Design a protein around this ligand. Structure first.
Ligand SMILES: Cc1cc(NC(=O)[C@H](c2ccccc2)N2CCCc3ccccc32)no1
Lengths: 129, 157, 36
């Protein structure tokens, strides 16, 4: 200890790839192989969509925190709060309430746009494969 | 050698990437000044953000004053026929308004922080233009563009 | 008799309307990506 503890962690990281190693073989079956190639194309499509996801969701996340907790000093946990809490924002809900209202309705319309964009992309990707 | 540096720094690809790196610098610095506090006077990196917006306004000003029509109202109108450029003018005006609200004492600091909280929304959605250049992100942005109209009619329903 | 009845009618209506509106979004947004 503590080298055995994070050695077990590295083993527990390795288990991921030692199951993903099955996709190669899954490429011999007449039905599994086209599916595996759909993961193959969907990874690049998903990567560009993650770029779009960061540009939209990160603006909403930083906006939420800016309109939320105003009394947090410089720490690296702020970066954790700007994609940890808005990742579970479904648990959450003068002009005053008007500003969060704009932020909330923007979050809903943005979630609608990106999720339906993503289904449209993954549905179009099925055609070429 | 000087001619080589001059030819490198006047190439449009270099101007593109070089503006983009400074823009990423803007976004990180403005994130820092919105997540961390403000004081009676602005912090140094907030002053950097203010100089970004002010010289951006001057650049938009010569974009007005160096267009092809010669009558000034026509210059302003043709300059305001591009949607992103219209919202650029709108954003510079709210950020200036947020600056005047930020410099005045409490309860105006809070409203200035609200205005700078809306500015990060716009200054990340400004990226969709530049994105529309990459071979894979451009059709995505154009789908978001048409999905505005389609989702709008769905909002009525 | 009316204690539970019309809440159930409203909830079933909200459920079915939510489903048809979501799949309306699905189909209309599958068309849009084809043209672009
Ligand atoms: C402040 C602030 C904004 C900013 N960037 C822009 O708003 C924009 C841009 C966007 C992405 C990449 C590179 C530049 N930009 C800067 C100069 C004026 C102008 C003219 C036409 C098109 C873009 C453009 N830099 O500081």
């Amino acid at each position: 200890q503590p080298f055995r503890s994070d050695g077990r962690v590295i083993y527990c990281v390795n288990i991921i790839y030692w199951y993903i190693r099955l996709l190669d073989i899954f490429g011999v079956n007449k039905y599994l192989g086209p599916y595996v190639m759909m993961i193959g194309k969907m990874m690049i499509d998903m990567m560009y969509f993650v770029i779009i996801m960061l540009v939209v969701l990160m603006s909403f996340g930083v906006a939420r925190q800016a309109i939320l907790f105003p009394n947090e000093e410089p720490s690296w946990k702020l970066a954790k709060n700007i994609f940890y809490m808005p990742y579970w924002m479904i648990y959450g809900e003068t002009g005053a309430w008007i500003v969060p209202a704009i932020m909330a309705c923007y979050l809903l319309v943005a979630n609608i746009l990106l999720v339906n964009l993503l289904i449209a992309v993954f549905n179009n990707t099925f055609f070429e494969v | 050698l000087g001619r080589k540096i001059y030819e490198f720094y006047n190439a449009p690809i270099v101007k593109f990437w070089f503006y983009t790196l400074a823009y990423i610098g803007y976004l990180m610095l403005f994130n820092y000044i919105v997540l961390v506090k403000m004081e009676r006077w602005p912090s140094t990196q907030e002053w950097i953000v203010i100089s970004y917006i002010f010289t951006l306004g001057i650049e938009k000003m010569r974009e007005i004053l160096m267009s092809e029509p010669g009558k000034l109202l026509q210059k302003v109108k043709v300059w305001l026929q591009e949607y992103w450029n219209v919202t650029d003018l709108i954003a510079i005006l709210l950020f200036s308004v947020g600056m005047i609200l930020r410099l005045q004492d409490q309860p105006f600091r809070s409203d200035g922080r609200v205005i700078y909280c809306v500015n990060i929304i716009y200054w990340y959605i400004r990226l969709l233009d530049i994105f529309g250049v990459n071979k894979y992100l451009g059709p995505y942005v154009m789908m978001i563009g048409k999905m505005m109209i389609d989702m709008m009619y769905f909002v009525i329903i």
